[PDB]
Amino acid sequence: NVAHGLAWSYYIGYLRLILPELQARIRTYNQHAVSQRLYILLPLDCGVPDNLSMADPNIRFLDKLPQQTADRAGIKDRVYSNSIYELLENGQRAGTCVLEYATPLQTLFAMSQYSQAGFSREDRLEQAKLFCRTLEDILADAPESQNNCRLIAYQEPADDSSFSLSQEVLRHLRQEE
């Protein structure tokens, strides 16, 4: 269903455009240290806040990369931007990386709320899973992915406290070892 098109659109109109130029952008910043790879958050609840420091204050915005621009579909200098965050753990800087949510999941969340979209609110989790799975299969085979990015899919427990998002990211970041 809908997650398949959105996963493909996310690759085609974003990942395949930005991944081949990412390492080069990261070097340039590091002169003027940031881990290689784009870390893409995939919350299966589709809860995508716009400010990441509100998902977890241990994720703390540092800076932006150098913008990448390109002429796209009649738009001159369409801008692709990405943000660099520091991951904190017990008050210590434990990691630095380019981190963001996968925006199509916010697009599934919204769809589920608009009547005329014929997308039922209880189909969210199944579409989110389909989106993650489609996207992994795309990136296994993707020439533009060689390292390059890491998917961080997760599901919060029902419905207690704990869950650290920073710790979730820190786990994958440490793996890169």
Ligand X SMILES: Nc1ncnc2c1ncn2[C@@H]1O[C@@H]2COP(=O)(O)O[C@H]3[C@@H](O)[C@H](n4cnc5c(N)ncnc54)O[C@@H]3COP(=O)(O)O[C@H]2[C@H]1O
Please select the residue that binds ligand X; options are 9, 67, 83, 155, rule is CB under 6 A.
9
Q: What would the DSSP string read from start to end of 48-111?
A: --S-HHHH-TTEEEEEEPPPEEEEETTEEEEEE--EEEEEEETTEEEEEEEEEE-THHHHHHHH
96 has binding-site annotation: no
Q: Which does 125 bind (CB under 5 to 8 A by kind): a copy of itself, ligand X, none?
A: none
| Helices 2-10 and 124-140, axial angle in degrees (round to 10) | 40
- Unique residue bearing structure tokens 């589709």: 46
Site string for ligand X, 33-72 (x = CB under 6 A): ----------------------------------------
The answer to whether residue 107 forms part of the interface with ligand X (CB under 6 A) is: yes
Nearest distance from residue 7's CB to a copy of itself, in Å? 9
Instruction: Please give the angle made by the CA atoms of 117, 131 and 170, to the nearest 5 degrees.
Output: 130
How is residue 152 annotated by DSSP?
E
Q: Which residues bind a copy of itself (CB under 8 A)?
A: 2, 4-6, 8-9, 12-13, 41, 48, 50-52, 61, 64, 67, 70-79, 81-83, 85, 99-104, 106-107, 110-111, 114, 116-119, 137-138, 141
Residues that bind ligand X (CB under 6 A): 9-10, 13-14, 75, 78, 80, 103-104, 107
